[model samples]
Target chain A: TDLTEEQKETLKKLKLYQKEYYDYESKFEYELFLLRQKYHDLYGPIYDKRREALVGNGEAKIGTPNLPEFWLRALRNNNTVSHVIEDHDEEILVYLNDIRCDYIKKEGFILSFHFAPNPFFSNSVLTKTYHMKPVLLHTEATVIDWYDNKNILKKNVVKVQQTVNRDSFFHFFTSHKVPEVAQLEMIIEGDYEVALTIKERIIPYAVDYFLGII
Target chain B: TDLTEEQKETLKKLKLYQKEYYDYESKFEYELFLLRQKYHDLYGPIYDKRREALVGNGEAKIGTPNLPEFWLRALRNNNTVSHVIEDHDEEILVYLNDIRCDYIKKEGFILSFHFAPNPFFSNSVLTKTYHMKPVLLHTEATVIDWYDNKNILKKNVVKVQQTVNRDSFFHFFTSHKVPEVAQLEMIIEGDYEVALTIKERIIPYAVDYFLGII
Candidate 1:
């Protein structure tokens, strides 16, 4: 895209800001990963035993504390994510064994989710995989109009949102491509507040519900 | 698993503590997730573009900014995790796209990792999976010498470390299951201290890192 002189300066500053965020983003993941590893090393075993005791055994007797039901309940609890589920979708979810995410190179991020019928349920063992990719929708330049009381000097905007780009993730799920696994995609946009909401509140809350850390 | 009367009281208190921790853990992960999501939504696209510019297409020419090498550097920056890698593993890591985490249901949490081989690397497009299962190794009741303490009846232990569990998942890449994708599992234990860390420091730090609002 061709850019005016002002736009060129704006883009340069935007790139710099992007670079700064890029470094921070890389470091945040690194730090969080380490902390998470330390966390698992200490609590994974005890947490597993506690969960196993709830079921008593693989037998699917009523009121015996079924895990799948617990998970179903948690997913339902997610106010935002819950909107994506249909009645049949809920039923299909029973086969789900796990949901995970990865930051794929160049392509963006992908959430790999799995569904597999287990001995605890009446259904036969059929495993499926889902790949959910988060993609960016668009980018816009931050700019403003300039004016003077006497005459318009046509000056450049002193600073902008610093060319902050607004973005969000529209996540979708599908099992049509591969019968073995369902794929889901979520678009993460640069709506700063919304982004924080999903990260700080939504996903982590789901993590607890799914992991049974609660 | 048998416990003395004093040990029973201590255990009861521990359960109470666990309940409190459980709630805090829930909130911490929730907040942390939101922060992370928000951070990604805001910065992901910009970061991706900046990275693309540095490499300018994936062909391996000398002195070009390489992604895997960047990740390898980040991994090495990790004091604890880097120990898990061998020298050969370092070369293999460049093809790695991104490493991410999710709290999966029933099967506990899984760290979904992906690797895409470049021309410099021999492997083709492949995927590997890693499972993190938290299991309790053992729990020991804290007890003291009741008789020597001059108590007519055996009293309960006042303080205790409260026995916890241990765990790990390090078999995906080493198995040579897929030359292109190396699945690595990282365990996040529910240790009392770690639970506290997430609640107090890590998650809170992430909030700031992602969004400057805090």
Candidate 2:
């Protein structure tokens, strides 16, 4: 429709207000980031205490490895995490000590899974970085240095008819390139969901998850 | 594993910290709610001006309905919204004057679609209320009062096969009960996605959506 000068001016006003609204929205997001970081820091000692109780620190007089398979059991109980974790992966995950998240200022957050010295892999910590500027733009993962023939992601041999390749929870450590358009949504959605569940659910309430109460 | 008294105390401290973290998290969420509401109010005049320019109020010297099919065109351009809208729904949607949202305190929000007096329905506005306390617990929608033979959701006869039961965008206005376990996830996800898209995308950036820029 052909706009009168007044109508056009009204539209221009609308546009300016929209811009102003977005500006405030950005500030709100920044404040939220700070708030999240504040809590993340505040929760640090709590997570440390939990880890100390499970893995046994000098301060906490529990025996070494008081809680065997603590993180593994937590991950296994979650539906999204459970789907990705196979029987083979559980053995490797048994070495998982603690899952912690660190904010990358305004860009995104990183989830680090601390592991004990295990025969399966050499990496002490596996980290998944989600580079989200409000959306899950992309993600980066630590490359797992697998021991000889100990790669849970690749070594599962089938016995029924032929060798079968199955997905493993450890595959999350491998970096993902954007796939073909057909497979893009499924892959991104699944990956993002697991990352979010770990950050929001599994990390914050690890004990509840371990107990299967969540 | 049997926990030492010290280990038990450490675990208790961890749980207490977790509770404190959650308390802070709740405050952050409340602040976010206030921020959203703040912007929602600030955006009101802009939305009102835009509506006035399109539909023509006395202050805006445009003729009646300066921008014909404005809301319908905008809704059609959105992928999530367009999928549910069928060819038959277009005629009814052309009368849509404006789309607005109202926050229900910290619980959830209500989306209202204002329409001009039209032949299709008796009501001037249709509303969808999402009852969410963080997660979408349930939703309530206005019962659309269709004129005789104007019920778009029910009166679509099939051509080749026996009468087909096709889904329509109008189904969004119908109150949904929790379905059986089998269909629950699918139903809830679709409903939530569409509601979120409308709230987060279509309403705020209506012009961009109308122009297919976003």
Candidate 3:
């Protein structure tokens, strides 16, 4: 996008600019990953942090630290605008976006909209949003990084191109919704926004919080 | 059904574990999350320690420290795990299972039985026991610290709930009909998993492969 007129004209014809841009971005991924690694090495918590993160009363170790699993649901039902990642000590406390196949579409459309009927609520949410036949179907996603670390930017919004079945026009409007505070009213109930203390918890993780010590 | 008459009698006599278990667990959660915050000021940063435990990237700038949102994700997603509060060093990264809306049933069922459609593969595991639809409408979760901070563990399993219509189900069954025998699945997939190595630089984040570190 930031090219001189001559460069732009040449790029348009030969596409050299696009090639260079794509290549550079691809390279940037690895480099970005590497720099992150260095950061983790010096700052990542030790075995102790691992233990705490895993603590839970569930049948297995729950990853939703500081936030109870069921309670997390109540929050969702309460219409808490949720972003799939949280950070502290430059450490992430939660990220559980990928836990299913995302390609199923309802009877007439493109893809499934919401996951299970807000496991937090009654069968009503499911009943109200979907039909007995489930007109929408969630598409099949083989390798979705449920909550990629980058998707949790409080100051930024991550864009996910949720796709429905291209074959089915109805699939275009599967269970997906534009993430917003208005989610409650448009779909479920309204006036159920969860408190915002946790919202304050959402911040960039880094050593400034820890001062480099355990 | 397997219970003997004596066992059944005992079980029946023992108040149902339903609400009882839920209550106990809830109390435990309060003690862990709320009480922890109440620690003495002697705990200069109880908030910080907990932060480190939940999402701290190991690196610290003695003075000025901060992780960009992406880097924070990597740090949190990269670390060892346990179900204890004291086991963390505040260096551990993202506690995965926590951020998702699907924790009871819907989230689980969807991830288990979406669809086995992909030109590249087929082979199912884990889902045989759980599904979030029908009687499985409840949700539950488990957090994996991505390869326990290993660069090689690039396996991502998505299990969120989506509603197409009638709150149907969705899943991404990565049955792995084609194993990564020669060219392994390069998880350069994203920053979250990559952070594992960053925390243990040159070590590849795989606790299995390397042996030396703090």
Candidate 4:
């Protein structure tokens, strides 16, 4: 069916909005990621540079990460990292944080950050195939664009609408890459605004706070 | 099982990281929410500070949305947002370009900003529930960190770790909010130290490049 002028306008606007959301969201992710790696790599080395091997900060391991890397890595993975946490031996933690931090694709955050009503972590290459195993589907429902007093969905332009099945949000959030789970079903969301609320207002703040913004 | 001294240290670090992650995450969310409310109260007739009337940006309508609030109010009872993508629309090419020029959450350059995902006319306070959706996800992945060669998961305070989730990766790009799709995933990303190719990095980067930087 042909879309009305109003319908065409709505979809175009919605698509653009969706794109805008992704733009800032991705920038935030990568910038933080780069800094995180740098922090960890240089923390101890810089201290060592200033102090010296004997009593200085850089005496020990040959390939050791600086302090910032450890803390930032943990925060990024939602896991406890070394140096910052101070007490634990973080051998595998670094390995895991690195791979996990580095494996993301752009469209991925939609599922993990805003869509997945519930956030759970696991020991795997992807959320679905995690060794920890996934739990119940707990994300909020599917949604439609909450346009002026109405919620309409324009066709063609890729959009985040409602979902009927948990797997859609689940795979998106959990592990689709490893393929233990794939987005099997997702319909339009009922409360699109709430999901968006979390994405816009909640997510950035959560991360900023986690890393101790400036 | 009880953790070894080394493992305990790693766990402690991970735990601390987790706590910090949660705290900051929550804080970010709180601020965003509070800010939203404040904006609403401060500019009730304004339809958000981004309104075209005041801002002269965002498109006037997206036919898909801008409907009667009653239509959305009825969708509140739906269980799953199940529907099939049946078509497409092209006229929804408008955006709220003024925000970054003066908005609160501008992370970086906004030039990469894509078209609007949702039009401003889609909002309606009279609805029963608001719908939320993501706007972006990564198209590429990168090795943000590498596994520290030193720590062992079983024996030390730090375990081999990595992060591959959208929430963590989001710092890399700029956007109005998170994306609506899971373009990336975090999984058993082992420490191989391989960075994602440039083609992947450019997706979000391009979007932000299109927008002015934050």
Candidate 5:
């Protein structure tokens, strides 16, 4: 129908209020971010202690490991994480000591998976950086320093394809190049979802996950 | 390894901090809930005006319908909502005047779909209530008052089956009986996800959705 004067005025008013609502929503989001940061800071020491207890530190006596395969078991028990983790990945993941999420203020957060000195890779920490204000804009992952044929993300195949790409959790560490607009949705639904699960579920309730309770 | 004195102490401290962290997290969630409610209230008037402009009120001149198939087209454009909407459901959905979300404070929220008088259902408004603290505990939907042989959620079959359940968006209005433990995950991931998409994406950005920009 043709827009009447009163209807047009109402639409204009609605748009104004919508703008105001968005402003307030943004403020709420910022406040929520700060709140998350506050708790993240408070939980740092506790997480450190937990990590030390599992991995063994100078302050803690260690003969055998306190929690052998702690992070691996936790990740394996998680439905989302377990799907990506191949059998080959488990061997590498057993060396995973802890997973830490560090916020980058208003931008996004970095997920760092700390590894013990393992034969598979040289890097001690593999990190995935999400550069989202709120929605994921882009992501960057650490390039794995694979030792010779030990790369879990690729397989040596003597077929038409000389080397075949493998589906493994370690592939998460491979550099994610910016995709075309067409691939963005799949990237968010697939990769971003795993990142979110690790941050929200696996990190917060590690013990429960370790026990296969959640 | 056996828990050393220092390690045990550290564990105790960690647990204490975890409890404190949970307390603060709860507070943050409550605050977030209140914030959502605040904006929900503020947007109410604007939403009212928008609905009036589209649906035609006494103040707004109405000969021809304003924004014909407004909500239906918006819902169709959304990936999540569009998937559930069957061809048979569209005729009924054309009467969908507006969709509103009303929070139940600390508990959860109710989704109300306002419909103009139609041949499909008698109820002017069909509502779905979600009872959740943070995670979905249970949900209840309005039992649609379908006209005789007008229910889109069921199909007349000539085979062994007399009347078979059909997959339609209108089925969303059917009373959802609480499922067994095994089915809970599917319920949350499926039904809850659609509800979230409607509340977060469809309602807030109706015009954008209608324009198929998002």
Candidate 6:
């Protein structure tokens, strides 16, 4: 039942990681909100027009299949994309904005995700972009940090734009970067082309499907 | 029953006034809200700091005398200002900001009313400056019209500033200047010295009185 001093320190470090991660997580939300507010400031008109046109007529109909239903259908039906979403995660996915894609010629593809700011979400108007190809693949997140004394970096700024690169593996996982207070380890492994296909071919249609345009 | 056509038209115009006034009132609220959002955009931090210092800790207590009480007290006791306020207006007067005043050597005095934008009021960070002298007794306001069908002087803008000056007599009136649907009417009046005392001599002490500072 007794452990060595080194093992105790290792346990302590692991415990410390959880605290640091959570601190990082809350600040991440606050920072992300400001980033989104500023982002929307630049793209408000563009976003507003798209929203008005695509969001549908009048108030959302009761007992009707709306954007979220279409989103679930598109994801569940798609062989490549269905594996990533879970039933509990549906509540969060409904908040996802339309996915936009562009063919970059020679470059595999550029897929953009627009997220509306919701009370359930820490940020507003979150736009995440994936630039994928077979050779090189990575997911990019804007540098979001707590802009206060308790900041992960201990800065007084609420939002700072520094590009952070993480592997595209999270997108392929069951959790799919799900935000929660409880910590869960994500196992990562996937081919860029497989990942790239989901981002490029799979998502473009998913967007159209959700919008009822397809 | 034997009314002439001109008399009927006059009756119609009088009926139109009530509809126009109510319509103007609602639009004024909406326009003022926009104007305030913009106003606070420039003066938010300053206003926030002032509020934190004045609003006290936590929430207001139930069954307690506060700013409105002292405001009514000061107004009712003073002969000059008391004449302007009425029993019906007490509900609205509670939201008025702390008045700031300053005396200039020979130019008489300047009375400043800095109103914090409130839900009950239509404007934000509204700073009204009264320049006054005992020798010249009078007031001012403007009948601001919608310059064109599409305003902002031909551009589609809700709020605009044009250099149209009128005597400042509206400040002393019970009704003040009610904004119209098509145009804005600002009434101006009052002696600067008398108005200046309410801000400088009256407010500073009144603030202390309310805070139990004195």
For model 5, the stretches where C-alpha displacement exceeds 4 angstroms are A1-7, A49-97, A105-107, A115-122, A131-139, A144-171, A178-194, A207-214, B1-10, B52-97, B104-108, B116-122, B131-139, B144-169, B178-194, B207-214
lDDT of 1 by residue, A21-93 (tens): 6577677777676655554444444434433433345654332143434445556665555555545445445
Off by more than 4 A, model 3: A1-18, A33-214, B1-214
Query: Can you give the DockQ of every candidate in the order shown?
Result: 0.03, 0.34, 0.01, 0.03, 0.25, 0.00
Candidate 4 per-residue C-alpha lDDT over B29-106 given as tens digits, one digit per residue, 9 for 90 to 100? 565556445533433232222233222334433211342121122112121210111111112122222221112141
Indicate which candidate wins on lDDT.
Answer: 2
| Clashing residue pairs in candidate 2 (N, C-alpha, C atoms within 3 angstroms) | none
**Candidate with more favorable, higher DockQ: 3 or 6:** 3
Error of 1 at B180 (Å): 54
lDDT by residue for model 6 (A1-214), tens: 2545653443354334334434544565565545434533443343343333334436432111232344455555665555656554455456554554444441434444444443333443333344444434444443332223322222133366443433221233222232223333223233334445555454434433333333
Model 4 spans > 4 angstroms off? A43-214, B1-214
What lDDT is reached at residue B27 by model 1? 62
Error of 2 at A182 (Å): 5.3
What local lDDT does model 1 show for residue B14? 36
* Per-prediction TM-score: 0.26, 0.79, 0.17, 0.22, 0.70, 0.24
Deviation from native of the Cα of residue B109 in model 1, angstroms: 35
lDDT of 4 by residue, A1-214 (tens): 2556754454455346536545555655555556544543433332233122111233333212223233233234332111122222232223222111112221122323111111122222222111211222333212222234121121222355542321122222222212212233332132233234333432323323333542
Question: What digit string (tens of lDDT, one per residue) describes model 3 on residues A139-176?
Answer: 22112222433222212333665432222111112233
Q: Which TM-score values does chain B get in all models?
A: 0.35, 0.83, 0.22, 0.25, 0.79, 0.38
Model 5 per-residue lDDT tens digits across residues A129-173: 988755667778898888987876788755564787878887676
Q: Ten-residue segment with the worst summed lDDT in candidate 3 chain A? A: A202-211
Candidate 1's residue-wise lDDT over B127-157, tens digit each? Answer: 2223323443322221212223222122324
Give residue A195's lDDT in candidate 5 (0 to 100). Answer: 90
Looking at model 5, the pairs that clash are none
Per-residue CA lDDT of candidate 6, range B24-80, in tens? 445555655454345324333433333333343355421111223444454455555
Interface RMSD of each: 11.1, 3.0, 21.8, 11.5, 3.5, 22.5
Chain A TM-score by candidate, in order: 0.36, 0.82, 0.24, 0.24, 0.80, 0.41
Better of 1 and 3 by lDDT: 1
Model 5, position B98, has a per-residue lDDT of: 85
- Give the per-residue lDDT digits (tens) of candidate 5, residues B67-173: 66778888899988899888988888888878999876437789999887788878888999988855767778888988887877889655675887879887676
Worst 10 residues of 1 chain B by lDDT: B175-184
Point to the candidate with the largest TM-score.
2
